[PDB]
A paper describes a structure:
We have focused our work on the iron(II)/α-KetoAcid-dependent Oxygenases (αKAOs), a mechanistically diverse superfamily of enzymes that use dioxygen as the oxidant to catalyze several reactions via C-H bond activation, mostly hydroxylation. These enzymes operate with three substrates, dioxygen, α-ketoglutarate (α-KG) and a primary substrate. One of these, [name], catalyzes the formation of (3S)-3-hydroxy-L-lysine, while five others, KDO2 to KDO6, promote the formation of (4R)-4-hydroxy-L-lysine. We based our analysis on the structures that we solved by X-ray crystallography of two of the regiodivergent αKAOs active towards L-lysine, namely [name] from [name], that catalyzes the C-3 hydroxylation, and KDO5, from Flavobacterium sp., that catalyzes the C-4 hydroxylation.
Numbering used by the authors: 30 to 358
The structure:
Amino acid sequence: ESDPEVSAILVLTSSEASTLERVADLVTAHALYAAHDFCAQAQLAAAELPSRVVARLQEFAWGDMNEGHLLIKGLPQVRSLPPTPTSNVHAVAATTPMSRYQALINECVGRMIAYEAEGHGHTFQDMVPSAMSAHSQTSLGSAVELELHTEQAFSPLRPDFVSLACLRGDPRALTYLFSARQLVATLTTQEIAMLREPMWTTTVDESFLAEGRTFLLGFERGPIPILSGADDDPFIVFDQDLMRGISAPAQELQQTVIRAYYAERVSHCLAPGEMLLIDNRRAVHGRSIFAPRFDGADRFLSRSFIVADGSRSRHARSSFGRVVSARFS
């Protein structure tokens, strides 16, 4: 029954939540139609947040031994929440007061970014159940478990962080988290060395494909390792559906990672007023089966992405643009 610990939990006091609510009034631009102005206003207004909150976010952003995630509780209550949309085309979360609270916290950590090939390049995406993709390996699934993965395993432009703010929760929908440090603690020396070898080719996610769309990096990339970086602070790239072992031992090692994940993963049921930051280099994430009703009261998260460095994607964006063009993913 492992859950996110006190070190990986930031609880806002009533006073801190009130400051955050007032500071959100400094963020006035349209999140979808003036994304850069919106994000830059949030980055500047974030200087007005409580110092204790800013300190925890900057520590998490630095990354060194950060646990892989940070759960924030006590965000100001979403009071006039519209019904949960049945698809992600409406971008309902992007005009809620939560989008401003989420942007302020995000912009303490790093620069918000979006991807043309992911949820229409929306600054905030509605993470809601899809009746079509219910049995699919996507953030809109429900009837099947969302398998352990890092976000955009195939892409060098993958986000540094995934930001999930909860508008409506579902009691059966558990978010699973598993860090590269937790993984390495269960493995033998030989398994760690092998995961550090470039033995996995990676393929572009099927949802990124489109008629007449060509990727500069091609459809199949690598081979790449699963583990990299410092021995005591390893980075992870993992996705069974998009990473193919170049040999039978390479395929067996992904099974080793999956078993360690089922044995050691921590869980948390996201509730309204909560926000989860996942370090996409240090942890993998998943989600349990749940049973949505598609009745306007379903689980509803606002998803956004963060990168430490916006210059890394400049070649893939327009001037004062926050959207990475699909061909560069």
